[PDB]
Write an enzyme that holds these catalytic residues in place. Structure first.
Site: not given
Length: 149
Positions: A35, A21
């Site tokens: 992210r 992520d």
């Protein structure tokens, strides 16, 4: 009219992924830490081995999919652009493909939790997760709820 969804991803190039992520993407000529919003790609924070929930595979899939894609696009929703970490909260897209969906749909990334601001793609996100949960692909292939005690 609802014709211009303006939900088109866009970034530039992906330098490298950190934890599925968390990846360093070069936007507007700058390598910033991105992210995946409303998603979780590995959370190895227990020091068990690196396969408690496909944590090592989460980054590998996102790392290889981004470094191999050649073209990465990011989409910033209404959510916070920085989760108190000066990062770039947003959805990641490779060569016109949804990374979050591919991760969750495959069983590599789960559904995060946004306090407020980011809840536009929460529909498809929850769907991909549910399908992987009920089917038990990978990430959801070792989360025995244990209905009882």
């Amino acid at each position: 009219a609802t014709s211009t969804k303006k939900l088109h991803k866009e970034a530039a190039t992906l330098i490298k992924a950190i934890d599925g992520d968390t990846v360093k993407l070069m936007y507007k000529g700058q390598a910033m830490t991105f992210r995946l919003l409303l998603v979780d790609t590995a959370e190895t924070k227990h020091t068990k081995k690196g396969v408690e929930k496909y944590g090592a595979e989460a980054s590998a899939f996102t790392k290889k999919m981004v470094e191999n894609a050649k073209k990465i696009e990011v989409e910033f929703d209404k959510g916070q652009r920085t989760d108190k970490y000066g990062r770039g909260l947003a959805y990641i897209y490779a060569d016109g493909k949804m990374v979050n969906e591919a991760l969750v749909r495959q069983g590599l990334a789960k559904v995060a939790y946004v306090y407020k601001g980011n809840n536009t793609h929460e529909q498809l996100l929850r769907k991909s997760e549910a399908q992987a949960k009920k089917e038990k692909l990978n990430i959801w292939s070792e989360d025995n709820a244990d209905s009882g005690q």
